[PDB]
Copies of this chain bind each other. A is one copy, B any other.
Amino acid sequence: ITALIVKGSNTERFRDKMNDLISFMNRKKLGRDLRSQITGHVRLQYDSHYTDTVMLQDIPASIRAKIAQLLYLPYIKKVPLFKGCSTEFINQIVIRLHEEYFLPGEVITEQGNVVDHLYFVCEGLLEALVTKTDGSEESVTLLGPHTSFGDISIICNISQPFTVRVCELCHLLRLDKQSFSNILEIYFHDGRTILNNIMEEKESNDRIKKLESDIVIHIGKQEAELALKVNSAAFQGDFYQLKSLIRSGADPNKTDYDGRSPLHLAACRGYEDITLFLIQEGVDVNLKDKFGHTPLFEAVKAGQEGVIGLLVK
């Protein structure tokens, strides 16, 4: 019987963790309001025991991704942002998601703040109050289940458009802003899907403010970057990324804003590997930039005798 008691009960662990928290709060003089919020949140972790993912921490990341693709996957499929997006993008979002539960009344994000976390609303009701210039907050949308907030702010690189408050115990799937941006960059095609989804969302009911004007920015920028990335990797010397960039898209004959193909920069910087790879791509060897310069001229001007010979042959 004593062993059974000493093994511990859920409320006993609640008591210990809460008392530790109260020690830390009082000693750091957090403040009545903040003490109330943190106590409420961890009390939530102890009433619903949603922080049962601690066992998950032991289970390795591959199996964790599998459990993620069994639990978080349906909601993220339903998410309006990830409509028509590639399965790989969906999976990467699911793997990087973290479960959270927020008690009613809690202000998750505040209008004007930097959105460091993009939340997927899964099981709950929230609010989208806009803190106007006067300060009155009108509920833009109820942001019901299977939705997302923090998303337009992260992608459009604008501050938080509206304050989000909790109506009912909400099961949010949090995603770090930086992880979202990295996944967005790594899959540029799925990013294109996100941006057209954002634009078609404007044609739909997304109750957004001001103007987004980013799909067209993405149409220009994704392609212009990918070409630039090719040229910049050539100039820096990143042959390894250059192969992947050429295979991903654009064209090894693509030129920059000044009309410089990657061969020009590879010749100037004396990179025989990149120069050879462009040779197998059949890149123009007499292509001339806005300043009337051929890659042979750049190889000679920099005295890259090996690259000079490669271009001469």
Residues of chain B within 8 A (CB-CB) of A49 are: 23-24, 27
A141 located at the interface, meaning its Cβ lies under 8 Å from any Cβ of chain B in the complex? no
Residue of B with least CB distance to A27? B49
A211 located at the interface, meaning its Cβ lies under 8 Å from any Cβ of chain B in the complex? no
Q: Are A116 and B133 touching (Cβ within 8 A)?
A: no
Min CB distance, A157 to chain B, in Å? 10
Min CB distance, A85 to chain B, in Å? 13
Known contacts A67-B38, A186-B178: A133-B248 contact under CB 8 Å? yes
A63 located at the interface, meaning its Cβ lies under 8 Å from any Cβ of chain B in the complex? yes
Q: Are B117 and A71 touching (Cβ within 8 A)?
A: no
A107 located at the interface, meaning its Cβ lies under 8 Å from any Cβ of chain B in the complex? yes
Residue of B with least CB distance to A105? B62
Residue of B with least CB distance to A134? B88
Known contacts A63-B106, A105-B62: A71-B28 contact under CB 8 Å? yes
Min CB distance, A34 to chain B, in Å? 6
Known contacts A20-B55, A135-B88, A248-B133: A107-B3 contact under CB 8 Å? no
Q: Are A100 and B60 touching (Cβ within 8 A)?
A: yes
Within 8 A of B (CB), among A1-40: 2-3, 5-7, 17, 20-21, 23-24, 27-28, 30-31, 34, 37-38
A114 located at the interface, meaning its Cβ lies under 8 Å from any Cβ of chain B in the complex? yes
Residues of chain B within 8 A (CB-CB) of A17 are: 55
Count residues on chain A whose CB falls below 8 Å from chain B CBs: 68
A91 located at the interface, meaning its Cβ lies under 8 Å from any Cβ of chain B in the complex? yes
Q: Are A102 and B60 touching (Cβ within 8 A)?
A: yes
Residues of chain B within 8 A (CB-CB) of A186 are: 133, 178
A42 located at the interface, meaning its Cβ lies under 8 Å from any Cβ of chain B in the complex? yes
Residue of B with least CB distance to A65? B116
Residues of chain B within 8 A (CB-CB) of A133 are: 88, 186-187, 248
Q: Are B106 and A34 touching (Cβ within 8 A)?
A: no
Q: Are B117 and A20 touching (Cβ within 8 A)?
A: no
Q: Mark A43-64, 1 if CB is under 8 A from B, else 0.
A: 0010001011011101111110
Q: Are B187 and A178 touching (Cβ within 8 A)?
A: yes
Residues of chain B within 8 A (CB-CB) of A189 are: 181
The 3 closest A-B pairs by CB, nearest first: A20-B55, A3-B5, A88-B135
Taking A38-B67, A60-B100, A62-B165 as given, write out 17 further A-B residue pairs in contact, using a Cβ cutoff of 8 Å, ordered by the A residue number: A2-B2, A3-B5, A24-B52, A24-B55, A31-B70, A38-B63, A60-B174, A61-B100, A62-B107, A62-B117, A65-B116, A87-B114, A87-B135, A91-B135, A178-B188, A181-B189, A209-B273
Task: List 23 A–B pairs whose Cβ atoms lie within 8 Å, in order of A's numbering.
Answer: A2-B5, A6-B6, A17-B55, A28-B71, A31-B70, A34-B66, A34-B70, A37-B66, A38-B67, A41-B60, A60-B102, A61-B100, A61-B116, A62-B106, A63-B106, A87-B114, A87-B135, A88-B134, A88-B135, A91-B114, A133-B186, A178-B190, A181-B188
